[PDB]
Design a protein around this ligand. Sequence first.
Ligand SMILES: CC(C)(COP(=O)(O)OP(=O)(O)OC[C@H]1O[C@@H](n2cnc3c(N)ncnc32)[C@H](OP(=O)(O)O)[C@@H]1OP(=O)(O)O)[C@@H](O)C(=O)NCCC(=O)NCCS
Lengths: 386, 386, 386, 392
Amino acid sequence: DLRLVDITETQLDDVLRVRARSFGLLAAGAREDWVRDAVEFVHDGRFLGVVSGDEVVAAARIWDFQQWWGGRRVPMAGIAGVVVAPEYRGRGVGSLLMRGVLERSRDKGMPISALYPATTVIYRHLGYEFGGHRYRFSFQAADLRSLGGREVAVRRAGAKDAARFLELVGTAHEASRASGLLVWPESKIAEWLEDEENFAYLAEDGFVVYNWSDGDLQVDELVAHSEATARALWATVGSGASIARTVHAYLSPNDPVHLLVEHEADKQAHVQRWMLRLLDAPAAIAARGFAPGAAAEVDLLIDDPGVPAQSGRWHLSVADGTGELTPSDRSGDVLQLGSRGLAALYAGTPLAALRTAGLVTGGPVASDRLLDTAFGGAAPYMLDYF
Amino acid sequence: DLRLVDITETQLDDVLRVRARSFGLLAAGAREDWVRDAVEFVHDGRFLGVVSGDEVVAAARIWDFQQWWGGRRVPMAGIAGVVVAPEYRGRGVGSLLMRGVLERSRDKGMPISALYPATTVIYRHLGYEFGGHRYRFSFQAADLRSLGGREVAVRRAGAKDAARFLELVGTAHEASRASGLLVWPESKIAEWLEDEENFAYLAEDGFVVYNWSDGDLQVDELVAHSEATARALWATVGSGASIARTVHAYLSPNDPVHLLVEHEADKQAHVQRWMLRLLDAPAAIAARGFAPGAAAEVDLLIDDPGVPAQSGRWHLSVADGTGELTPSDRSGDVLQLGSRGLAALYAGTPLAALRTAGLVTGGPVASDRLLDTAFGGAAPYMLDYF
Amino acid sequence: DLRLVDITETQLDDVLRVRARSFGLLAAGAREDWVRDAVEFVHDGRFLGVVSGDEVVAAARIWDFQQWWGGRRVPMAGIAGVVVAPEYRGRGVGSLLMRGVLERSRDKGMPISALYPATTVIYRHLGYEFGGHRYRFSFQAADLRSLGGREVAVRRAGAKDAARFLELVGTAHEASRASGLLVWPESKIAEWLEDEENFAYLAEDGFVVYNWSDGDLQVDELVAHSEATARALWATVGSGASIARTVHAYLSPNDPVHLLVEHEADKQAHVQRWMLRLLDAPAAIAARGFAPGAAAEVDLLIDDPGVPAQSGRWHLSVADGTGELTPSDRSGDVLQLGSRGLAALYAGTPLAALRTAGLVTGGPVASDRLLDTAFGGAAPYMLDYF
Amino acid sequence: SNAVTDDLRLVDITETQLDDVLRVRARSFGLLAAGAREDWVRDAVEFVHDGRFLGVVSGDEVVAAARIWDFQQWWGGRRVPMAGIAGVVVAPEYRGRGVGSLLMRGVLERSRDKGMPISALYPATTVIYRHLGYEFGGHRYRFSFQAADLRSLGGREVAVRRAGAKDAARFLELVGTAHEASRASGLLVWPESKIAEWLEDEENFAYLAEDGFVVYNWSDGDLQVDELVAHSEATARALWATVGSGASIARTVHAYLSPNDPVHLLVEHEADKQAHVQRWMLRLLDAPAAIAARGFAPGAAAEVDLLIDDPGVPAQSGRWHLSVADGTGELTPSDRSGDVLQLGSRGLAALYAGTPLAALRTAGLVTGGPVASDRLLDTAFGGAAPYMLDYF
Ligand SMILES: CC(C)(COP(=O)(O)OP(=O)(O)OC[C@H]1O[C@@H](n2cnc3c(N)ncnc32)[C@H](OP(=O)(O)O)[C@@H]1OP(=O)(O)O)[C@@H](O)C(=O)NCCC(=O)NCCS
């Protein structure tokens, strides 16, 4: 009796009721902000639901992201707000919903999907697997304050600097061949920079955005193309040390700040994980950046009953930072993988780990080494939660 | 009045006084145990001190480790127990000690050195830089118990099994081309396993060692070549769930366990950093494993006033998993590095980060891509603190 | 110059001032809800105060409850919001107030009165004694989620279902001969179920009402006539285990959930006590339910200077589930009790403890067995605080 | 484990196997301090010599172990011999393979052979014990009071003296008198010898009046009452005031006692809202003998059939008639076949412990039979809520 639907504006009240019984209550002001954001999802076909009769019983949204992979931007479906009414849980409703979400993401031409799961079981069944991390580290403000770079011009930034921020990030991630980071629309970055609770500063070759977190400061993002600039931006955040003793920062464990500060980040850190799924393997491969110098001619046997279109035997050809995935008619021993193994592989997870987890099977070890290096590079991470 | 010396047995009581005023007091039992372990260092010339008159004023010891790098074992001088008497601190005594340590380390043919620093400043001045991590993750015991694997034969292990453990771990790290991990003497492993407080279990293709940690269980090390065995070993630890709610484990963030367990490790994790220094760059390179398929022909200009023998221009040649560093007399623009950047590079830290931290300067961007992939591979980590 | 009055609607602002200086400030929002509730009390003659000249100096409210005793509903005056202006405390004003409250509740035809005391001294002087408990137990949501009962129809409930909730509760408490539980007017039950912060669910023979409690779930009440329904309703609460780790529940220590769940409730529990007083002993006895099979013919000598109409020598006759308290002409040795011992005995507190507390004196031990079993039965408890 | 080579069998643990049991225990509960091991071995030998220490071996390696305390347990104011199961441990690589169940079946059999009609334990996990027929039967409560409040309870006129080992038999008399008068249920009866050990321990502070006693000790800066027994108001006040006299140093007194304890009626400030509530489980091993030894509620009368389904103890299984009158009960075979209350071991144990029939039916532990039987059984097994002061 259940039906998958496109959520409309007039159903948002019912979606909010299912939400209140899933995540918790919304404050009266936060509810108005939620509805405002829900509208753009509705009118772009990125708000799916399940109805029982005329009752909305489950819902999920799809962010129109791009995600960095090996220094290139790949269209990505970010799944958010997955909720099911308590009395409709444990009956296949969430799965029905998510299958509809996957189909909608494919139709919109998004070759990959990511999410932060509250429970892993349902998403693993649908073929998602952990693909990367989000790290929060804690530093002493007084240490950051003293980093110097006082000669660098740093000015307060605002909504009007959105395009410049995008440019700066793009240059950085392309040079480092970064993986995992989200690309937001210029419009959402403008909102971000316009929020008066966010403190943003811009230098010629870097920027920082930070805010208050319970008496301490929290860095949402710092980007810097040179040492003097990194120092000046960290020093700007740390300049509040007379009040904030601690600054937490979302960044990679490979961030240069660890090499710059005197006092090591606190041993206690936050490490969260996000999941990835491939929806259109050839398009995802064609869009991914590959490791400089890496060459590979490898066959892959994909078994994905969730997305039958990418099932079957493929040939993976990688050269000069580019890869292509084409149908193969060969017969030798071949690496066999399901949706989970495929996602984890694309995300750069070591074949050794994937074999031990049982996500990948068969194939010569010679293939393993070439795949490892091909998908290798910086560890995927994200700065944002969604 | 200040002299570097080799610490003797009769001086151990004075080293313990300095230690007491540096790290804190030792229980009457750990006292006797400390002396036992110290004697081996004394006799192998791996216990250095500084005297003022006839008084021991500073001391440090050197572990004769090996360390895995790209799947090969590299001899490594592990520095421990660096202490200076309070009234002698801040006067260069610690630095004099450490230069004697680096010198002794070189004489014993160890091409690299690592340590966990309480303060970064003295070691950075000496040329060390952060090279890798030690991660502790926390899981729910009941969730590990549910992994199953009970069909897999598993027996209690003892000191007699030390050689077998070494075989299993060697096979694992060579397959994954691991970096960072310590190699302990078989004698040290036998002791580890003899200890009644350590619970060691052995399968055909894996092992686990764990113990109690304040009411929780703590996994020191788990090695497993197959899924069934990984399940069996983790489930053996988790079988104590009726008493211990939580299992903490030292392992990599790429460990297959994250792919197997239902509930994600606690967001709250321990992340520690250890530092590295190259003492003999040509030998360290020649001993390192390199990424499969990686090729590179690049010049490097090393400026290391701490070890002038490795200073000057070099040619790095990497092919087929092996690298060689030879003297170069070429001119023109070249990647320039101090000891800190050199260690970080060797450890796999990306050049983009090194450049932003100011640890590396000059040279074409072409070289950076070559270097990154050459030194690429799994992120370096350690299971042990010392 | 101190005068007891009936609180009028225009004195409510004065009451709130007293309350602010007694319990703490009210949010401007919550203040409006307090007025809304206070109006009903004023009109029905259930809001008393003490004035000093013009200004209100003290106030207290009387809820028009019924309370289950031995499976029957007894009219009960629930005392709430007892407050005295700080500079008027310790001068007998609170006791003047409460004698007014006791006077008023009897006049309204209420045989018993109950309250949660912030201090025991004043209420003990007025003749109240502890009669029962309110328990909170903490369970693992994952455990509740898996209880099953999937076959049982469970639907979302609302204000409209208020009458059916009353019916189900009525059937349960009569079958168990429950004691201590409050009976709310169908009006307040409606508001309860209207409140969007409360999540209510109905089955053919059971229901549950729960809500968020700081990231955990809290069950206000769960009633189930059958195993299948008990499982289904607990599973409905537990279905949120992906977000809520813990489910707190107000229930009896005899609740069947303890017999169903795999993991025992946390050792750490909440145990609060509420107090009871008899206002009209013969009517209280006449309305109480008595243990099946129990028969007793025993005299009581009551000394209650707070309610002199109850005082004197009485004869308790108990047979076939009902009891009767009659004036007695007999002369010899007899159990003597004051108001505190009387209330405690009514509540089912065993004679042995009453004697050791000194709340009851004299009489033969043959009488004690007669009394114990007469007033014996399930331990009295409440789900609600007031 | 290694099923190919394992040869698992139940044994009686010997004195020379204690070191091996200690290995299994360390990997189960945690390491023992040096001084605590000494006290464990000495205690273990007693169990070994009385045939109350069972284990499982594989070949000649000890793989599991459990011991049986020779307790008595109060039920409705009478003492019932009871097998208290403790230290249940299985080596990690042998868990989840039926070893603990094989051990515990041997434990139940040894307990029956020794004439104990009931058994109790504090379970770390309920699953294995419910499969074997145990169910929750009662509680252990810890409440916390303000010491300064206890200190002013009075009773200065009551003679209170320091007690020691030689007062063990007097303590048992006082406890006995109290529990018979209140028809108490759940409480442990320890051997006089074990009580003497308790009172000779310098860390325990014991005081004795003419009609009561108290034993208490330090608990991390606060005081903890292990047990207080008092027959009269004056004595209760005096003994609580003895404990509370420590208030200048200890702000808080924790106490193990029933929620029905008179102290709640005596003290000004009520116990902290935050309390400890632990549960222990019960199983009947010989139901007729358990019923015969139980005290039953004064005035209670009941004639009711029970259909017992206990394949764990076949001798208990079948249809029985329960006769209760004048405080005494008897269970005899019935040849009737009409509608009857049906229960397994879990429901039987819970019913014996006084759990309400309504709860047992909702929990599914009890099925069928007329509603009229429910009321009779409820009052028969009714009385004070079972509790225990001790953990084991
Ligand atoms: C003694 C004990 C707890 C059980 O002995 P054992 O030889 O492991 O027991 P075994 O006879 O093999 O199985 C009987 C049943 O019990 C279940 N089950 C067992 N354990 C747990 C659990 N943790 N959590 C949940 N359930 C558990 C088993 O489930 P499965 O593993 O088969 O799915 C069996 O149920 P079934 O599958 O038929 O539904 C042992 O594991 C131990 O020493 N633990 C640590 C020390 C300790 O706590 N000591 C003090 C204790 S006071």
